Design a binder for this molecule. Structure first.
Ligand SMILES: *C(=C)C1=C(C)C(Cc2[nH]c(Cc3[nH]c(CC4=NC(=O)[C@H](C)[C@H]4C=C)c(C)c3CCC(=O)O)c(CCC(=O)O)c2C)=NC1=O
Lengths: 132, 132
């Protein structure tokens, strides 16, 4: 399913958007501590990486609202290109970050919603995976 | 976290997106019929489809703001998308939002209309800043 279902899920991912970005950031840094190590070490560069993580979640919930994966093809691609060019973020790092966001988001949902939700995450991963 | 009022407006705009986007399109063509005439920027089926696509995505950005209780989704997704749209390369952009505003507001009582109207206005403002 319903337009109520989409809104139900979107309001969940909005309300808990900080719990998700936090969870997903810890999962990322436990799994890949070389990002948080001296070799996202700086507070300004770690802030941008967190800013960019929250942005991907926003983009997902939007696509969930719209029932549509076209925004990923439109503004998603623009932003992922702008990341590795200007900010030098590696493709494996972004792909893994979105896997961590996926996991954390889905933990709040039930199996009916999570099945409806999971492909939106996967679509961004697939749309990046072709590069590296 | 999300108010009961804003969930309901968000569900109402989402459930009637077709009608709203239909009504916003014909109001735009009524007021500016040159746009879908042989010369104009919405004549060709591609360009008219992209206008239809984008209009609907703006209505979902409004819905998303309502759920956020915040203009954050416009800050996060709106501004970046606006910039890129005009880079592709224009007062029709802003007038289509105004018809979308009035098409949307027409579904709502005065209490709900006053909660939603600012988000349209933020998007009209954000657009105006790309004037030559
Ligand atoms: C009618 C007054 C009308 C027209 C003709 C258009 C739009 C339009 N937009 C593009 C490209 C384009 N639009 C956006 C917006 C956008 N992307 C998102 O993901 C957001 C959810 C949404 C904002 C609400 C973007 C980012 C882009 C660039 C990428 C792309 O979609 O191609 C075009 C032509 C593009 C080209 O190929 O040159 C046109 C004609 N909107 C109207 O209201």
């Amino acid at each position: 399913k319903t337009s109520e279902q989409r809104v139900n899920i979107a309001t969940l991912l909005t309300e808990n958007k900080k719990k998700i970005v936090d969870k997903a950031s810890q999962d990322l840094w436990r799994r890949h501590p070389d990002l948080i190590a001296p070799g996202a070490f700086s507070q300004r560069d770690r802030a941008l990486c967190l800013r960019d993580r929250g942005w991907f979640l926003h983009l997902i919930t939007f696509c969930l609202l719209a029932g549509d994966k076209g925004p990923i093809e439109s503004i998603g691609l623009i932003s992922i290109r702008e990341m590795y060019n200007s900010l030098g973020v590696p493709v494996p790092a972004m792909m893994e970050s979105i896997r961590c966001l996926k996991e954390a988001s889905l933990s709040l949902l039930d199996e009916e919603d999570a099945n409806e939700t999971a492909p939106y995450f996967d679509y961004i991963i697939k749309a990046m995976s072709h590069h590296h």
